[PDB]
Amino acid sequence: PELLLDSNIRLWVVLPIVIITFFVGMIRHYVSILLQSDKKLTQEQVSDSQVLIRSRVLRENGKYIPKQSFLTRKYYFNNPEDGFFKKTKRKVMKGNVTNVLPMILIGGWINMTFSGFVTTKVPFPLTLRFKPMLQQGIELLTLDASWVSSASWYFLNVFGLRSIYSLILGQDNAADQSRMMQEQMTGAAMAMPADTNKAFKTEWEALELTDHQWALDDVEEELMAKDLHFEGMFKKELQTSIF
């Protein structure tokens, strides 16, 4: 420990840079929420989207289905005579997650404002080939690389609060009536691309590739068993009265 620093530089650099990066992240998040815009939806695209969801749930949950009704559904989807997939046919800079440019600009402005500065030292032993990285404005060759400048301080700061931001924020799930509309919107946003023919053919062949295994036949497992949960359960239902 050396290089006795002033107490009036830590109160005008560290707290300002921390608050700046925190509120810059908050601004970015809230502005991203604000700029989000809904997408126009045609009733037809919603229609094939829901048809695809129906085929998917048929593929996923098909064990608990009467065999006759299962082949009825499979034939209706396939129907080699007419078929619904076969005839019903429709007709047919480099912005990449822009979050690096703002942080780079902020770091560049912060480094431009502070020319010759010593913010804090890092306990971690660092090599001398990272000295041009870290100081960038201090004319010292005998000094160690532990003492970093404000640029690296802010660069480590933006990653320090990356997981902290999610602590304050979170996910939301409400509006049961609007939940269905959200599901249709997202599902048809999945089904935007105009490749209906190949998707229909792929689903048509995939549905044939599925087999049937009635999971309802295995009933004998339950018959030879013990029913004791239904009274520990029944004991804890009695105490509650009627409001």
**Interface residues with other proteins (CB under 8 A)?**
2-9, 12, 16, 19-20, 23-24, 26-27, 30-31, 33-34, 36, 38, 114-118, 138-140, 142-143, 174-175, 178
Closest distance between other proteins and the C-beta of residue 16, in Å?
6
Element holding 120 (H helix, E strand)? strand 120-121
d(CA 152, CA 107): 9
Nearer to other proteins (CB atom), residue 30 or residue 76? 30
Closest distance between other proteins and the C-beta of residue 207, in Å?
36
Q: Are 114 and 135 in contact (CB under 8 A)?
A: no
d(CA 34, CA 74): 45
Torsion of CA 56, 61, 65, 68, to 10 degrees: 30
Closest distance between other proteins and the C-beta of residue 3, in Å?
5
Nearer to other proteins (CB atom), residue 37 or residue 43? 37
Nearest one of 140, 137, 134 to 114, comparing CA atoms: 137
Return the amino acid letter for 36: Q
Nearer to other proteins (CB atom), residue 36 or residue 69? 36
Closest distance between other proteins and the C-beta of residue 45, in Å?
20
Nearer to other proteins (CB atom), residue 76 or residue 130? 130
